[PDB]
C-alpha cells in the first residue's frame, strides 16, 4: 500500500511523489488505483504527444479533485513508473478543465538525489522552453478526447506551491 | 494484492487484465506470483521471438490450467508490465501443449481507453497478419525448450470467448 | 548519391520515399542535404510531440516551395532515418504555411513490403484517429518555433495524391 | 510485501533476488523500501556509467550493512525493475567504502530459467571483461558523489559466496 | 562509396562486413542498394522474430545467388545499420532456399575491436543456444512471407568459412 | 561526400559538426572513414560508460594528431549517428594521451536549432555536473582498453575554442 509512504520527510519543501507516467514515455496515461495500488491504464492518448516531465502525486493528500494533489517532477532522466521521488515543490500550474479546475505543482529533486537543480528555487529558474512546453502539453494533449477541454490559467510561485500541499495534508485527516 | 482488482466492471464484455509481458518486449517470460504479487522471471526464451501482443490474465478466475485464465490484449503501444487494462474479449485461441490443453483469449481495449478498435467485435476484425502472427508465436516460441511442445488447434468467437470467462468467474468461488 | 533513385518503379502508383524523420522518434527534425546527402539536424522541437508517421520526400521530384514532394509513410514499425520505403499514395493533406501554401502526401507501403495496407486505397481506409493525429501534429508541432504557423485546410483523395506526384516528377531533374 | 518471497527454494545454491536496478539501465540508483515495497530513487548517478549487470538483494536476509545482502545477477537481457530472479551464487566481491565494508555476490540464473550459464560454477567462468567491468563500475561510479569513496578489495569463490548467504539467512531470525 | 571498402585488411582471416540489419532490432529487413548505397526497406517481417546477430555482407565479394557474401556478426551490442564491422569468420551455416541453395557465414569481431571473442575460433565455441537461435531464426523468419521457405542443412567449420570468403572475393570486382 | 560540407557557415562562431557517436548511446565507439564515408565500428567499449554528449568532428579541419577537430556537442536529445549539427563552441578540454597531447572542444547548438543554449556562452554556463561528467568520462572510458590512458589537464575558455577552430581550418583542405 502506497499509503505507507508519508507525504514527505519535512513538508512542505520535502514531498514524496509517486510517479505514474515517466517523462518522454509512450503515449499512455497511467493512473494508480488507491485500493489495489496497481498501475491502471486510463487512456491511450489520441494526440501525438508525450509528457514533458514525470507526473504523479503526493501520497496521503487530498485536493478538490477528489484525488490527491498532482505533481510534475523534473529529472535528468525519466524515472520508472511506480517510483517515488524525494523532491521539492517550486511552482503551481493553474488551469481550468471540463470538470471545474485542476492544479498541478512543478517539483524538482532534492540535495541528496541530484545537484542538478540546487539553484532552482522557483519554476522561473527552469528553462523557459520547458515551462512553455509544459503549458503546451496540457492545453493540447486532450484535443482528441471528445467532450474534454483544457485551458491554461497562470503560474504561481513555490511559496504558494508549498501552500497547497499544506492544505492537502490535513484535508486527508 | 492483485486480488483486490475485480475480474472486471461488467463481465463478460468488460474484463480487467493484469499484463505480465508487454508487447514487442525483451525475450523474457514474466509471471506474477499469486502469493507475493511480485513479477517472477519464468524463463529467458530460447527462440529469437517476441510476444505479438501484451499477454496477461484476468484477476480472480480459474480454468483447468490450475492458474487463472490467460488473455492477449491488442494495444496501440505496449503497456508497462504489471499494468491492468480494461478490455473486452473478442476471441479464443485453443491449442494443445505438453501438459494437456491451454486456451488463450484475445482481447481489445474499451470505449474509454481507446477508439482504435470500436469496430473490433471479434478476432476476425483484427488484421489477418496479427492473427497469423499470434498463431505463429505460440507454435514456435518453445521450440528450444527441451521436452515442451505446442500445437495450435483453432479459433473461437467472442461469444464463446465471453463464455469461458463466465465459467472461470465462479470456478474461483 | 540519393538522386540516383527514381521517383518510383512505376510512378505514380509505385513510388519511393527517402525517410528524413522516423515515426515515434525523438523530437528531432532532420532534413537531408542534397549537396552532400548527409543528414542535417534542422530543429530540436520545442513542442512535446512526435511524428505520427515517418516523414520524408520523393527523389527526383520538385514541388512549389522549391523542395521535393513531402510524403508521410505509415509503416508497422518506424524505419531507420535515411532509408528508402517503396510505397503507394492514398491521400493528400493540404495546409497554409508562413511562406504560403503547403501539402503533405500520405502513403502506405508497397504490397511486396507488407500485406497490412493492401485494402487501404484511400486515406479514409486508415484509422480515423491516425488521420486526426496527423492533422493535429502538423497544426501544433510548430507552436513553439517562432515565425512559423500551420493551418489545416483539408484532405484530398488518393487520385489527387497521384496527380501531385505526376506534377512533381514533371518539373524536376 | 516482498517479505512473502522466501530467500530461495534451496539455499544456498538457489537464492531469489529482487532486482532494484536493471542492467544497462538509465543512470539512476533505485532502492526498494522495506516498509512500503515501493521503488525509491536513491540518487541520479553523477558519473556517465551504467550498471554492468542487474543488481538487487536476496529477500529475508541481513548482513552488516544493516540492509539485506546485495547480489549482482548476469542475464542474457536485462530484467524489469522489481522482478525476482531464481539464481545461483557464484562469487563474492569484497570492497571497502566510506562507511566500513560492503560485500556483493555475483549470481547467475538457474537450470529452469536459462541454459546460458550451465557451465558457470564460479565467477571465473564468466568472461574476464565482465569481471573487470564489474570491478571498474563500483570503483568509479561514486567518483562524483561528494564524501563517498569505493576501493575494490578482492574476489572470493562460490563456496564462500554460498557461505555469506548461510549466515545472512539466520541473522534475520 | 561502399565498394570503396576491401573485403578485408588481410582476408580471409581479417574481413570487413557492412551491416544491413542490426541485432535485436525492429523486424525490418533492410538491404543496401549498390546503385545508390542507400538503405532500402526490403520487408516488414510477418513473423514475430528478430535477428539474433547483425546481418550484413562482405564488400567486394560475389556469391552464387548474385549478391555479396552473407555474414552474421556476433557483437556485444547491436551495431548501427550501415556500419562496417572488422571481424573474423568462425563457421558457416548451410541451407536450401526457394531459389536453390544458400549459405550464411557467422563471424566474431576482430581482436582489436573486442577481447570477448578471441578464444572463439570455431562456431562451436559460441554458446550452444546462440547457434540454435540462428538455426531457428532462419528456419522460421520467412514462415509468413509467401513464396519463401528455408531448410536448415547443417553447419561447416571455420576453415570452410574462410574458403568461401576466398571464393567470393575471387569472382568479384 | 562528407568533406563537401564547410567547417561552418560563418566560422569560428558558426560551425558544423558531423556526429560520430551519439549521447547516452550504446558503448560503441564509431569513427567515420574518409576514404569511404561509411561508419566504422572502432571499439566495443570495455568500461561500462556512455558518451555524455554526442561526439564528432568538424569537416574541412586538420588538427595535430592528423585527424579533424574533435567536438562534443551538447543537445537536448541525442542526434542520429552520422548527422550534422550546426553549433557554436563554448569551451575546450585539454588532456594528454598515450600518443601525446589531445584536445576536445565542447559546443552547444546554433540559435536557430534550439533556444535552450543561447545564454550558454562559456562552458562554465553549462551545468557543473555535466562539465564533471565529461572530465570523468574521458579520464576513465579507456581504463580497460590496453595501451591507452587519458590524463585530464584542464579547460580553456570559449575564445580559445574559436582559436583552435581557426587553426584547424587553417592547415586543412
Numbering used by the authors:
A (entry chain E), B (entry chain E), C (entry chain A), D (entry chain E), E (entry chain A), F (entry chain A): 1 to 173
Could you give the paper's own sentences about this structure?
The side chain of Arg30 also affects the position of Arg44. The structure of K30R showed that the side chain of the Arg residue did not point in the same direction as the lysine residue in the WT enzyme. This suggests that Lys30 also plays a role in PPi binding. In contrast, K30R and K143R lost almost all the activity, demonstrating that Lys30 and Lys143 play key roles in AbPPase hydrolyzing activity. We also found that a highly conserved lysine residue (K30) in the AbPPase catalytic center is phosphorylated during PPi hydrolysis, and mutation of this lysine abolishes catalytic activity, suggesting that phosphorylated K30 is a catalytic intermediate.
However, because PPi is stable under normal conditions, inorganic pyrophosphatase (PPase) has evolved to specifically hydrolysis the molecule. Here, we solved four crystal structures of a family I type PPase from a strain of the pathogen Acinetobacter baumannii. The crystal structures of AbPPase showed that the enzyme has a typical Rossman fold domain that is highly conserved compared to other PPases. Family I PPases are hexamers formed by two stacks of trimers.
